[PDB]
Design a protein around this ligand. Structure first.
Ligand code: MG
Ligand code: MG
Ligand code: MG
Ligand code: MG
Ligand code: MG
Ligand code: MG
Ligand code: MG
Ligand code: MG
Ligand code: MG
Ligand code: MG
Ligand code: MG
Ligand code: MG
Ligand code: MG
Ligand code: MG
Ligand code: MG
Ligand code: MG
Ligand code: MG
Ligand code: MG
Ligand code: MG
Ligand code: MG
Ligand code: MG
Ligand code: MG
Ligand code: MG
Ligand code: MG
Ligand code: MG
Ligand code: MG
Ligand code: MG
Ligand code: MG
Ligand code: MG
Ligand code: MG
Ligand code: MG
Ligand code: MG
Ligand code: MG
Ligand code: MG
Ligand code: MG
Ligand code: MG
Ligand code: MG
Ligand code: MG
Ligand code: MG
Ligand code: MG
Ligand code: MG
Ligand code: MG
Ligand code: MG
Ligand code: MG
Ligand code: MG
Ligand code: MG
Ligand code: MG
Ligand code: MG
Ligand code: MG
Ligand code: MG
Ligand code: MG
Ligand code: MG
Ligand code: MG
Ligand code: MG
Ligand code: MG
Ligand code: MG
Ligand code: MG
Ligand code: MG
Ligand code: MG
Ligand code: MG
Ligand code: MG
Ligand code: MG
Ligand code: MG
Ligand code: MG
Ligand code: MG
Ligand code: MG
Ligand code: MG
Ligand code: MG
Ligand code: MG
Ligand code: MG
Ligand code: MG
Ligand code: MG
Ligand code: MG
Ligand code: MG
Ligand code: MG
Ligand code: MG
Ligand code: MG
Ligand code: MG
Ligand code: MG
Ligand code: MG
Ligand code: MG
Ligand code: MG
Ligand code: MG
Ligand code: MG
Ligand code: MG
Ligand code: MG
Ligand code: MG
Ligand code: MG
Ligand code: MG
Ligand code: MG
Ligand code: MG
Ligand code: MG
Ligand code: MG
Ligand code: MG
Ligand code: MG
Ligand code: MG
Ligand code: MG
Ligand code: MG
Ligand code: MG
Lengths: 63, 146, 100, 49
RNA sequence: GACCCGGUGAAAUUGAACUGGCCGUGAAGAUGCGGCCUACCCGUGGCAGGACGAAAAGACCCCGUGGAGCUUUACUGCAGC
RNA sequence: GGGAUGACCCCAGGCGGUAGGGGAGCGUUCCCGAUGCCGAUGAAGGCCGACCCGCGAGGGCGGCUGGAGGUAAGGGAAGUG
RNA sequence: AGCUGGGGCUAGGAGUGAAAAGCUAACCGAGCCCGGAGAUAGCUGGUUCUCCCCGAAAUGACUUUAGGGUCAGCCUCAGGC
RNA sequence: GCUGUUGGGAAGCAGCGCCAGAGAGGGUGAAAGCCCCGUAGGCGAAAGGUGGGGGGAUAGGUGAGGGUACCCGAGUACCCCGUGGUUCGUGGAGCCAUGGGGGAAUCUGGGCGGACCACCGCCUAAGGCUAAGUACUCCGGGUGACCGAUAGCGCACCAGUACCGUGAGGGAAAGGUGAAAAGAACCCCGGGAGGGGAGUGAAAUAGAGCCUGAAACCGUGGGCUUACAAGCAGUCACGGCCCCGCAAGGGGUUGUGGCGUGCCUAUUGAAGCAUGAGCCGGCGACUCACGGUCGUGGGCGAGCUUAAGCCGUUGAGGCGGAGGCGUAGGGAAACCGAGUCCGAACAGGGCGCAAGCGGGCCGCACGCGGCCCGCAAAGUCCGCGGCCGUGGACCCGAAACCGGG
RNA sequence: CGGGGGGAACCUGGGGAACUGAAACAUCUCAGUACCCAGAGGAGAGGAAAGAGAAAUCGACUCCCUGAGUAGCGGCGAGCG
């Protein structure tokens, strides 16, 4: 019956216009105590490939 | 055209795959020949299997919702004057939904590229650069909703 | 009850097979076999004697049944089907032309 | 649409009969010749574009 | 009892068989490959070395994120107090 | 490449194969085609064949048996080998 | 502390037990029947017509993972270059 | 609707007719509109049911002003503790129920709008009843790209039977003579059984558990061929004998010679002394529904398409725009928008956008409009196919777990 | 005057699992399902707002299609909705 939208996905990925899948970099959630600004700074979304193909299949209906 | 004369075109490939016999897909029957594919795998859309799947990701989507749910908010749907320049007179919502754009999606917001046509256009909102384009003799019956 | 057909203990014409043409009477209607008797299809039945009584046994015997369809009634004319008239107080089977 | 005519043909082994508002492709093709009356050629029209 | 005659008349098993020995060879122990040796065809009473003989999808051993019974200062609950 | 699109011709290479992918076909049940067409001068099935067609699955035709059904081209479904 | 007939009572985590986990209708560490139920089985087995073209892998990383998997490597088909 | 003809038998075939609001179907010795039963169309209830569909008859119901403030459902509302219900699993946890404790007011009342408070609103708890639309199918009927006796219900048959078990309960097998019994008088061998004649029939190898009657299996007769040979039983080659046809050629058999390690499965590797199979026949495993993703045959395309349901048919389709996709991308969001997000930044950078035409024709501006076109800008809808998700999801198999007996 | 039992499914109410799924497992899932009990009937239930929730809105209940796999719930896991 009507396939279901994986809400665990719907909560960490925004699927783009060209079809690419986007999510936030992993790291800076609590890791830190002293990481270069460069590292803690360089965290603002990214690509994924062959793996997002899989992602998109879970976000069916919500296109 | 005769009765016993139609028949599909030349591609309705009824030929679905039959599992088999000595020649073609056979025995183990196309795919298989191993084990653990005998009743259905895990996903594998998610599997994976044992180790943490790309779920090592992280909910960004700040705000997923409280418990009463979604807040009754007014949604606005943009519609470039580009398309708007398909007909003339005095375009307005409803006349836009009935057309081929908008439709119940609530409040009308004209903008986008395209060359603004000399005529009155009623909307709930207008983009800055859109309002400009209606410079070449147009309109601006904003607000509405009363 | 419903089990009813076209003939009764009267005169009929065989349209059948071996006796096409032959004409006869009272066919002692069955109709569990939906057949009649007439005067034809009469086979030779062997006999030992169902009990010494009436000793000897011959081969000329009785008349066999005949599918009710193989026969056609006749009266004041020839073959022909049967219709039904109301007799102003009855229901008698009459033939298209004659009358019985 | 004339039931009287319909009733008259019908039993003919070579005749397939229909009411105008029943005009369908399958029948048109299973027969060799098609015969409509003007009042039925209209309903047909009110259905074509 | 077994053996023979008249009577009656089963079974597990069985890919099919036109089913020998020795040295070899081969998935490491071949009637079935090689080379050689032996050997007319078919039975009957006997023996039990082989057909990795039969029977039981090894009870030992390991594997399965299998199962049950049992234990406790393993976990988490519950009755009862 | 011929291209007179002749899907037939010469030229040039290639054509072992498990898991697998791909492409063509054969046959079975049923539906349209069927108020049709085959059928007692014999249906379906069965038993034969040293003949015909096809690379193959098969399709023919013939003799015997059988005794009342069978079902073209062209397509459609699926409890289909 | 005997043996025995007839009439009765106690049963499934329950009975009964001079205690073997014995016995509870010829296999009791949890009876039998029907049902949930087509339990589950990352295991074993089996998987049926024909021809033509191509044709692997048995590696790496991670895996309560190690005879199972996900991504990559290697095969195939369509389109493009 | 008769006749003739073939035939055991016409309904076949033939000649010349006929009915049709009926040419659905079944039967009759074979194939039939006119022989039979029916079919179209049309009639029919004294009696028993059913029955506002249509009539009636009842019960029942028909007001404004201004005063009073009398009454508006109690162990209830309400609050706290323990829980259930809802999408809500302690959550910011409201709402509806309520086992415990405490415990009101009567419209200047009391509940609700997701803690709570103030505004603005919504509604009247603690009494009961109420057709229709909806569900099901033991039963009757009508249909089938449903089955056709290993199928279809477990049962086409004297089946929930025979048999099994103490019991709950389990649970079979088994259909067909022929058109018609015309079911074989009588004679002969025999105790009978069973046969041989005779006789019936179109057919008796339709003779009675009898239509057809395959394969395994058991025999009788014949042809070739075998007791010095040895083998996955075959194959290639000659030769002999037998059989077909005039011949060339072909069929059967096999004496020598050459070459030869069953099938399946599982494996790095099997003739393997690894698995499975006695042989034959029949049953036996990748489907279907709804989603999804590609591909593909079409329709229409700045768009495409309906769902339920309604009207029609009774193998006839229409209507129905609720709704869904698509036409704007960004942001966590407010929001902005061909941009947008981070940023102080017109630095940068992440997502984004920027779609014509190969091109016949032709109004016949020395202008290509724009009709047209692939099927796009570009999508949708339906069909088909591959794979994926949810379902038992390729088929068969546990040891076990739980419920009621 | 009534009641008692029977009735294939269907219906309401009172109680109410587990295998499974989470590739272990306990919250969660299976599921208020299977099953037990009581009751009712050709249906049963529900039913005229101490309602919905944002609309100067609707106006009993039930049933179908959408809304929507949305809003939300979730060891924010499986999944539920
Ligand atoms: Mg920063
Ligand atoms: Mg959607
Ligand atoms: Mg296998
Ligand atoms: Mg393996
Ligand atoms: Mg294996
Ligand atoms: Mg399974
Ligand atoms: Mg009378
Ligand atoms: Mg003896
Ligand atoms: Mg050796
Ligand atoms: Mg040797
Ligand atoms: Mg050999
Ligand atoms: Mg001996
Ligand atoms: Mg011995
Ligand atoms: Mg031994
Ligand atoms: Mg090849
Ligand atoms: Mg292959
Ligand atoms: Mg037909
Ligand atoms: Mg003849
Ligand atoms: Mg057939
Ligand atoms: Mg099958
Ligand atoms: Mg005593
Ligand atoms: Mg127990
Ligand atoms: Mg029990
Ligand atoms: Mg005790
Ligand atoms: Mg004792
Ligand atoms: Mg005990
Ligand atoms: Mg015992
Ligand atoms: Mg146990
Ligand atoms: Mg279950
Ligand atoms: Mg099972
Ligand atoms: Mg299974
Ligand atoms: Mg697996
Ligand atoms: Mg198959
Ligand atoms: Mg190759
Ligand atoms: Mg892979
Ligand atoms: Mg290519
Ligand atoms: Mg004849
Ligand atoms: Mg005649
Ligand atoms: Mg003929
Ligand atoms: Mg007839
Ligand atoms: Mg007929
Ligand atoms: Mg005639
Ligand atoms: Mg009638
Ligand atoms: Mg009456
Ligand atoms: Mg008062
Ligand atoms: Mg709760
Ligand atoms: Mg709660
Ligand atoms: Mg209380
Ligand atoms: Mg209280
Ligand atoms: Mg309240
Ligand atoms: Mg409250
Ligand atoms: Mg409140
Ligand atoms: Mg409220
Ligand atoms: Mg509020
Ligand atoms: Mg309210
Ligand atoms: Mg009330
Ligand atoms: Mg009230
Ligand atoms: Mg009520
Ligand atoms: Mg009611
Ligand atoms: Mg119904
Ligand atoms: Mg049966
Ligand atoms: Mg049979
Ligand atoms: Mg029955
Ligand atoms: Mg049976
Ligand atoms: Mg017994
Ligand atoms: Mg004779
Ligand atoms: Mg016969
Ligand atoms: Mg017959
Ligand atoms: Mg027979
Ligand atoms: Mg035989
Ligand atoms: Mg012989
Ligand atoms: Mg010698
Ligand atoms: Mg010799
Ligand atoms: Mg040889
Ligand atoms: Mg093995
Ligand atoms: Mg291998
Ligand atoms: Mg061997
Ligand atoms: Mg072996
Ligand atoms: Mg093994
Ligand atoms: Mg095997
Ligand atoms: Mg064996
Ligand atoms: Mg077999
Ligand atoms: Mg077989
Ligand atoms: Mg689908
Ligand atoms: Mg698809
Ligand atoms: Mg930018
Ligand atoms: Mg199974
Ligand atoms: Mg119990
Ligand atoms: Mg009563
Ligand atoms: Mg219930
Ligand atoms: Mg309940
Ligand atoms: Mg209940
Ligand atoms: Mg559980
Ligand atoms: Mg589990
Ligand atoms: Mg639930
Ligand atoms: Mg009713
Ligand atoms: Mg009711
Ligand atoms: Mg009703
Ligand atoms: Mg009221």
């Amino acid at each position: 019956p009507k396939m279901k939208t994986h809400k665990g996905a719907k909560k960490r990925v925004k699927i783009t216009a060209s079809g690419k899948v986007v999510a936030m970099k992993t790291g800076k959630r609590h890791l830190n105590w002293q990481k270069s600004g460069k590292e803690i700074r360089q965290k603002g979304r990214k690509f994924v490939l062959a793996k997002p193909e899989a992602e998109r299949i879970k976000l069916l209906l919500p296109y | 055209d005769l009765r016993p004369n139609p028949g599909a075109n030349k591609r309705r490939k009824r030929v679905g795959r039959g599992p088999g016999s000595g020649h073609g897909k056979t025995a183990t029957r196309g795919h298989k020949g191993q084990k653990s594919r005998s009743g259905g795998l895990k996903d594998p859309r998610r599997f994976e299997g044992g180790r943490s799947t790309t779920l090592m990701r992280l909910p960004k989507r700040g705000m997923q919702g409280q418990v009463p749910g979604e807040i009754k908010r007014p949604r606005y749907q943009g519609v470039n004057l580009k398309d708007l320049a398909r007909f003339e007179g005095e375009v307005t919502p409803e006349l836009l939904v009935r057309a081929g754009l908008l439709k119940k999606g609530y409040r009308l917001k004209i903008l986008g590229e395209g060359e603004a046509k000399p005529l009155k256009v009623v909307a709930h909102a207008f983009s800055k650069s859109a309002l400009e384009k209606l410079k070449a003799a147009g309109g601006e019956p904003v607000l509405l909703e009363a | 009850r419903v089990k009813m057909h076209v003939k009764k203990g009267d005169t009929v014409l065989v349209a059948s097979g071996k006796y096409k043409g032959r004409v006869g009477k009272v066919k002692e209607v069955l109709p569990k076999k939906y057949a009649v008797i007439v005067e034809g299809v009469n086979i030779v039945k062997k006999a030992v004697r169902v009990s010494p009584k009436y000793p000897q046994g011959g081969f000329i015997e009785k008349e066999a049944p005949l599918h009710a369809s193989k026969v056609r009634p006749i009266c004041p004319a020839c073959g022909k089907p049967t219709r039904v008239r109301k007799k102003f107080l009855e229901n008698g089977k009459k033939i298209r032309v004659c009358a019985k | 649409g004339n039931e009287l005519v319909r009733r008259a043909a019908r039993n003919l082994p070579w005749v397939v009969t229909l009411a105008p508002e029943g005009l369908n492709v399958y029948d048109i093709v299973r027969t060799e010749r098609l015969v409509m009356d003007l009042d039925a050629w209209e309903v047909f029209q009110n259905r074509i574009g």
